[PDB]
Design a protein around this ligand. Structure first.
Ligand SMILES: Nc1ncnc2c1ncn2[C@@H]1O[C@H](COP(=O)(O)OP(=O)(O)OP(=O)(O)O)[C@@H](O)[C@H]1O
Ligand code: CFM
Ligand code: CLF
Ligand code: SF4
Ligand SMILES: [Ca+2]
Ligand SMILES: [Ca+2]
Ligand SMILES: [Mg+2]
Lengths: 522, 476, 267, 522
């Protein structure tokens, strides 16, 4: 029942004895459910080392990924270029998912469209939807640019996007000069991060391949900045702020920041900010191109170094302390501008928080996961703070990557007790945290369940989940923080020391039991 | 409000190049409370025009999304690449009871993770090893539904055969469900494909088995996915009316619960578009009458509480009334508290194939008048049930597109609007109170009596919340 | 470096006619490569010397992923320094061959199989069934297409049918039908009849290839006619086809004909 | 016992059965402790409505304040003026506490000195120590200025700081031109916030009173900004950023920011940043002075309006949304510069987060406390978000204040269920969260115990503590965040929605019990 002035929702309502009764009668009645005994048993089982080997001997089934397909990573890339339209060649449900997904994370408008390829499409190929779709979309939402993407649907049938696009042009559906970059984005290959590469590079070329002859290396004396798949706006902003406060000329190729954060003031804005084509067009003239996350921008580098002839820096993702000074130092080597006293202070302010927080963080064993650049980044900074990165999982990582990381771990004494994991899904990490238990986990909302499962075993075995990465659906407005450079590192640190401090407060908040260690100050 | 919608429509549809122009102009028409078919007034369930910002899903969203996913004691394998699965892990809020990972596997996502090679060489050979790896890593799994994606539909794999072999081998039911994205216009085919998929591999198994006792009251709730608990919010009333709730299709469902539907005396169908197909085979093959009901708000639930009653004996009927009397004071109380706040305030909706017509009654009771609705995958028979539930000038859309919807919203100027996540934000930026209808915006049950309570409160916290008045900055 | 894709109705003579054309082209001291874009995997069997070597897709299967393969593993030199690679594929009634063609081509290009060596690159394309088997003719793949045909009502329906599909990639792209290559099945008036179709098409009949059993002697012995019997009558013929191709400057946009105009020819 | 590779600290160690045994023997043996029965009883008692009335009828004993003395608020004010020395006339242990305290919060160095007034001081007054102390300190730590304060000891014995200072000058201990402002800071009067007023105003005079004859109102066309006792550096920074990005001239009179955040880079800095005397000297030539927290700067206003003749604005602390646009609008009214499109965006971005997070925050009943400006601020913004500010306590508040807050509550319907409390200490609020229980508390680390005490009663009665304010000892680096204006409001909000979301995730993570409402997304 429900009483007016104290309305019980999802949680208190089914707890009421009246409802519990119901569910019991349903369960004992028509569910033919196993007895808790064996349920507890099978659980008790999965949480063991015996189950783990079984688990890992796995080769065809996958339970709970840490990855997504390429089309999703393409769409985010496109959102970055000013007034462009994420256009996905193929089915419409995907675009419906790609959208719904990016919504729950950023909690703002996600525009994207699709040629809706029906059954006939697979059979006859998809020429008219591409032809019309380019027209309809371009006519309805009035983009300045449309960047074509594709689902498995188009990949298998092997629709030539290129040809398909050009016919539509010649056939008279869209102004021949209308920018319409493309890339084949095989959802069944690589991952979402890969899409971003293919999608980006596609555009890097559309504006430069033909006009390569008249561009000089370092004509505008600026520094190109290639993001890659990045979902924390705080990071886009922070990287722009530093270069900017350095008096460094730069050009951020693919910048989501305005569009994924259009103010709620009464006017809806399908587009905002973004990288100008004229800007992407003029890219070659820069001094050099920088790739923030190079481990999923491997095809970009091939182009930039190859067609633009840029002497691309061997830099790591700007995370933690060291990698950041290295990032700035190199920018300093290139733009010509000094590392501002401003930035140097910031650095020292970060090292201050480290010396100041070092006690609590020292020795904390973690399990963590995410994209190849992120994890390689996070892990690093974890060694800097002096934590043991026990279990490091990266579902979309590769061999050359894994090795690179191991080595980063071979360097510090805090890392020699950690193992890397690639091509292994979440369900594997569920085991890792049971057989060799962490302190905490550092991942997305999906790690909410590995957390729960550890608690069912025992409060003493529960592994709290610190949410850094993507997605993050069970929390609000985290997408606005930063994980790159000094700024974003001030936060990572606080998030943990206070993540630890909180647990200690909970483990010790028992009256006349654990409260003696309830220090007022820590 | 007479020939304006027409001046509205023909203006919104003005931008559409003639290929799409003729088409869309037939998906949105003015509602005459009087027609009983739309072959004359409006058209639904046709192909979507390219690059137009549809919200419509695919056949998969129908099979792994709405119908199968919801079966807690089974493990639904998202056969195909690694994107579909992950995107819908815990997307739908169909609640359930159990030990996830051990006994239940719904907030979980199993995928065959197709790689480059799997596509080239095709892969039932992988699907099989994978149907094995479950039986061994998830023993309490009570059957396996293999939801196909697009690649499988092109490559041409016999996921139908393997499921017979592995399963005939592992002595476990395996449903070779075909839900290829490239199939059908909307998500609709997914349902029809699911329904049938069920009468074939699951439903027809307990046929020569009579260790069960049909009571003149036994029934099953069909088409209540239990978003938020709506299935429990309703299974409570029926049972408190004396009927015996035996099954529940998709929503804390049991594979076995689905297998006992053939033995019941009546099939109660809330969602017509999804299980309407099956309910008919349910009645031809087995011969079990079914009916449509509506548990959104007082007047609807109250009403329905009696319709399901008359299909039985007077006995249950007097008992029914007792239930209505019981909640009468509670729901009356709600209205007295919130109708005052919602009165007059008009609302605009957009959904799938049920709520568009089924939530209005819940509104009437609160005094919010609905001035616009639409479906994304319903058919003429679904609109056949709408025209009546609506007023006269009312504008209706079917697979409405960004431009189409957004301009109506901009012009009809609603106080409150209800649609999905893809839309939740577009209007929350135009300072128009938005309340998710699909996921109930992560809010409590709306079906039944207890549900109505939360609803009447959820429209109030959003619609009259302080936020809205703070949109345009003073200096402007 | 030119890239020509050789098409045709299977069972008329794509592989021999190509492997013999490049054998000849090798003879002329050219840097040539043969990409085998066919599930059968016999596009190189005559230049390398065996049933077939380790193909891309078959090979990439062993390493788990194609990105794990190395050009070194699929690319093998053969006769006259001709390089060869196979696209690979599944077996009759399973998987998707049209994909392999894509996967294999993307791989070669991706791994820079093109960048530093060749004068000619020949894509031996199987059946033009779907999207994938058109891969050899997009931008940056092949610019010249040489459809192979005969004097048979169905051999031409195909020569015609294929070129039709080409206008799709020819209008939007730069790929062009260079000409037809006739392997006389020794049908009557087969000679000019083809020349007829090559005209109603808008191309030329590059050259006419005889029916000389030296091809089976070579085929069954695991080698090309040019290495088998250098002076044999059809050894030179295949040398002529090579010389004509090299010096060919005629590349047009096909003009399909209709069944009616087609059967009219024969009739 | 302790095993080398798994050293158990304070909390795990005494949990060991060996230690539990010990404590039991101590307890049953020599403590003569009451039986848990009556202990539980007396507790059960205190947690009642009967005990509450008894509690509140209280009129002489105080249990756990929410204020500090004045000298502490003086010292912080001083830290603000460039190269000055917090100088406290009196006992030496006072400053030893003042320091230790400010450490634990900011966790950086806190310099302050004292004329160690020994017993003789009380008996003969404190002339020499003031004389010498001014010399020694000025000679050792080499200030540019020393702002004298006073502990209980000087107040009673009524040492005239003024005279005492001037003798030392004439007597030749310190350069007669050496800046040495002063202010009697009766710890037994008002509160710490009050000290800040007395201390500030003192200085506002030292550099103006005599020179008033040649200054023109609005000669430099700038806007004075008087912060008041503020301990969140993020707030000093944020207020400077806005004015600054408006192109508005200003002068932050009293600016701790650099000094309370000196980078650890190897060089210790006793001083950094701060407001220049030459800046404080020129103050009157501004257009107008703004007081960010008027409720404890009442003596400043009297001076500024009186001596400087400034038409001081009737603004409230810039907190939440409305009080910020008002702050900016007024600044726009004065400076001449308009509200930048930049700031307007920011605003809309905040309203976006509100509409986006409104559901979770709507109706949440809170209990809160802090300084008069803070609470008045926070409360306000809580109504904006649509939460019920049930119990509002302010230990150092006054009547004029209380009734200004009530009125702010009279306006919104979400405020008609809240009561104000002034002159009431923490121990009173311990009762209020028991008789009429919140959702959460919003205060300092001291509210860590009210939290604990609610749990001992029942997990279903526990009131989680959200830390906003001062002190904050059990957590690290929060001092860097912001609570003022849009920026600092983006945070307040996230901190709650996610404070709520977290609890819902804890309340609901019981397997097959409450985990059904464990929505992946919220
Ligand atoms: N010059 C020729 N005269 C007569 N028959 C020939 C000649 N050249 C090849 N053949 C015969 O043609 C048959 C197939 O030849 P080839 O290998 O060219 O096949 P194909 O159709 O091109 O292969 P695929 O379509 O499978 O790629 C063999 O039986 C071969 O003996
Ligand atoms: S949009 Fe129901 S026909 Fe289907 S997921 Fe929702 S209005 Fe669906 S009632 Fe239903 S439980 Fe749903 S809300 Fe029929 S199941 S394809 Mo999106
Ligand atoms: S209709 Fe292939 S991996 Fe899955 S989202 Fe696609 S790009 Fe990515 Fe429906 S069955 Fe699935 S969501 Fe067919 S493919 Fe879309
Ligand atoms: S017809 Fe082509 S794209 Fe289709 S399954 Fe066969 S090989 Fe693949
Ligand atoms: Ca938003
Ligand atoms: Ca510090
Ligand atoms: Mg061949």
């Amino acid at each position: 029942s429900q009483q007016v002035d104290k309305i019980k929702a999802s949680y208190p309502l089914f707890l009421d004895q009246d409802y519990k009764d119901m569910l019991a009668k349903k369960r004992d009645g028509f569910e033919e459910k196993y007895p808790q005994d064996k349920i507890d048993e099978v659980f008790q089982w999965t949480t063991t080392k015996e189950y783990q080997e079984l688990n890992f001997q796995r080769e065809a089934l996958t339970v709970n990924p840490a990855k997504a397909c390429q089309p999703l990573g393409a769409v985010l890339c496109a959102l970055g270029f000013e007034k462009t339209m994420p256009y996905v060649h193929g089915s419409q449900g995907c675009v419906a998912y790609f959208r719904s997904y990016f919504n729950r994370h950023f909690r703002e408008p996600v525009s994207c469209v699709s040629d809706s390829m029906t059954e006939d499409a697979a059979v006859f190929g998809g020429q008219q939807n591409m032809k019309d779709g380019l027209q309809n979309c371009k006519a309805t939402y009035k983009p300045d640019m449309i960047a074509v993407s594709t689902t498995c649907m188009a990949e298998v049938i092997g629709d030539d996007l290129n040809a398909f696009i050009n016919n539509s042009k010649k056939e008279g559906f869209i102004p021949d000069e209308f920018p319409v970059p493309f890339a084949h984005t095989p959802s069944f290959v690589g991952s979402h991060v890969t899409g971003w590469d293919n999608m980006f590079e596609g555009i890097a070329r559309y504006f430069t391949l033909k006009s390569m002859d008249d561009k000089v290396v370092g004509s505008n004396k600026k520094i190109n900045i290639v993001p890659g798949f990045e979902t924390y706006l705080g990071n886009f902003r922070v990287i722009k702020r530093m270069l900017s406060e350095m008096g460094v000329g730069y050009s951020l190729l693919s910048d989501p920041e305005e569009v994924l954060d259009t103010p709620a003031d009464g006017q809806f804005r399908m587009y905002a900010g973004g990288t100008t084509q004229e800007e992407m067009k003029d890219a070659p003239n820069a001094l050099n191109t920088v790739l923030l996350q190079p481990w999923h921008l491997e095809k970009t580098k091939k182009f930039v170094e190859g067609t633009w002839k840029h002497e691309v820096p061997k830099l790591n993702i700007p995370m933690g302390l060291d990698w950041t000074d290295e990032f700035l130092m190199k920018v300093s080597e290139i733009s010509g501008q000094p590392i501002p006293a401003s930035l140097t202070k910031e650095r020292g302010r970060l090292v201050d928080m480290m010396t100041d927080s070092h006690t609590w963080l020292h020795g904390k064993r973690f399990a963590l996961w995410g994209d190849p650049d992120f994890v390689m980044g996070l892990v690093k900074f974890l060694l800097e703070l002096g934590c043991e990165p026990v279990h490091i999982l990266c579902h979309n990582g590769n061999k050359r990557w894994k090795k690179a990381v191991d080595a980063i771990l071979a360097a510090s004494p805090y890392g020699k007790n950690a193992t890397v994991y690639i091509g292994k899904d979440l369900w594997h990490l569920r085991s890792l945290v049971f057989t060799d238990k962490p302190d905490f986990m550092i991942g997305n909302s999906y790690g909410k369940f590995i957390q729960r499962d550890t608690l069912h075993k025992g409060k003493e075995f529960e592994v709290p989940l610190i949410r850094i990465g993507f997605p993050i659906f069970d929390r609000h407005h985290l997408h606005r923080s930063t994980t790159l450079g000094y700024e974003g590192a001030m936060q990572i640190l606080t998030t943990l020391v206070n993540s630890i401090l909180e647990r200690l407060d909970e483990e010790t908040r028992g009256m006349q039991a654990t409260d003696y260690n309830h220090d007022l100050v820590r | 409000s007479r020939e304006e919608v027409e001046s509205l429509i023909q203006e919104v549809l003005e931008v559409y190049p003639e290929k799409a122009r003729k088409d869309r102009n037939k998906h949105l028409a003015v509602n005459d409370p009087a027609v009983t078919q739309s072959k004359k007034c409006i058209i639904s369930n046709k192909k979507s025009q390219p690059g137009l910002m549809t919200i419509r899903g695919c056949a998969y969203a129908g099979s792994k999304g709405v119908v199968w996913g919801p079966i807690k004691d089974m493990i639904h394998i998202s056969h195909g690449p690694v994107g579909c699965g992950q995107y819908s892990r815990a997307g739908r809020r169909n609640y359930y009871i159990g030990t996830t990972g051990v006994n239940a596997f719904v907030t979980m996502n199993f995928t065959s993770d197709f790689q480059e090679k799997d596509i080239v060489f095709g892969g039932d050979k992988k699907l099989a090893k994978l149907i094995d790896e479950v039986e061994t890593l998830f023993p309490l799994n009570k059957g396996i539904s293999v939801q196909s994606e697009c690649p499988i539909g092109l490559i041409g794999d016999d996921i139908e055969s393997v499921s017979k072999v592995k399963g005939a081998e592992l002595s476990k039911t395996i449903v070779p469900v075909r839900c290829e994205g490239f199939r059908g216009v909307s998500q609709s085919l997914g349902h029809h494909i699911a329904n049938d998929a069920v009468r074939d591999w699951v439903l027809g198994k307990r046929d020569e088995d009579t260790t069960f006792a049909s009571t003149p009251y036994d029934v099953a709730i069909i088409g209540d996915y239990n978003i938020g608990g709506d299935a429990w919010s309703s299974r409570i009333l029926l049972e408190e009316m004396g009927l015996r709730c035996v099954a529940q299709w998709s929503g804390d469902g049991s594979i076995s619960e689905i297998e006992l539907t053939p033995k019941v005396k009546l099939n109660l169908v809330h969602c017509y578009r999804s299980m309407n197909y099956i309910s008919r085979h349910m009645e031809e093959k087995y011969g079990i009458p079914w009916m449509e009901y509506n548990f959104f708000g007082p007047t609807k639930t109250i009403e329905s509480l009696r319709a399901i009653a008359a299909k039985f004996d007077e006995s249950i009927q007097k008992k029914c009334e007792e239930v209505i009397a019981k909640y009468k004071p509670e729901w009356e109380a709600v209205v007295a508290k919130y109708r005052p706040r919602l009165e007059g305030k008009r609302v605009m909706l957009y959904i799938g194939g049920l709520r568009p017509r089924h939530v209005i009654g819940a509104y009437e009771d609160l005094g919010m008048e609905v001035v616009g609705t639409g479906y994304e995958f319903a058919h003429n028979d679904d609109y056949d049930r709408t025209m009546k539930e609506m007023g006269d000038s009312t504008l209706l859309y079917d697979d409405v597109t960004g431009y189409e919807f957004e301009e109506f919203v901009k012009r009809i100027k609603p106080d409150l609007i209800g649609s999905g996540i893809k839309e939740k934000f577009i209007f929350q930026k135009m300072g128009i109170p938005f309340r998710e209808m699909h996921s109930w915006d992560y809010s409590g049950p709306y079906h039944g009596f207890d549900g109505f309570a939360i609803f009447a409160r959820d429209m109030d916290m959003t619609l009259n919340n302080p936020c809205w008045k703070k949109l345009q900055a003073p200096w402007e | 470096m030119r890239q020509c894709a050789i098409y045709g109705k299977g069972g008329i003579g794509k592989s021999t006619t190509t492997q013999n054309l490049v054998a000849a082209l090798a003879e002329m001291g050219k840097k040539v490569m043969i990409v085998g874009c066919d599930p059968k995997a016999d596009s190189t069997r005559l230049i390398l010397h065996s049933k077939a070597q380790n193909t891309i897709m078959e090979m990439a299967a062993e390493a788990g992923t194609v990105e794990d393969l190395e050009l070194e593993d699929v690319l093998k030199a053969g006769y006259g320094g001709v390089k060869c690679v196979e696209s690979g594929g599944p077996e009759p009634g399973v998987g998707c061959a049209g994909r392999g063609v894509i996967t294999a081509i993307n791989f070669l290009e991706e791994e820079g199989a093109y960048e530093d060596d060749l004068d000619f690159v020949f894509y031996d394309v199987g059946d033009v069934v779907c999207g994938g088997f058109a891969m050899p003719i997009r931008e940056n793949k092949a610019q010249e297409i040489y459809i192979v045909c005969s004097g048979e009502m169905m051999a031409m329906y195909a020569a015609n049918n294929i070129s039709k599909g080409i206008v799709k990639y020819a209008n939007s792209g730069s790929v062009r039908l260079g000409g037809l290559i006739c392997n006389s099945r020794n049908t009557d008036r087969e000679d000019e009849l083809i020349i007829a179709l090559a005209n109603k098409l808008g191309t030329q009949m590059i050259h006419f290839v005889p029916r000389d059993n030296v091809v089976q002697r070579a085929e069954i012995r695991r080698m090309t006619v040019i290495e088998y019997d250098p002076k044999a009558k059809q050894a030179d013929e295949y040398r002529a086809l090579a010389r004509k191709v090299v010096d060919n400057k005629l590349l047009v946009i096909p003009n399909p004909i209709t069944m009616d105009e087609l059967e009219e020819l024969l009739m």
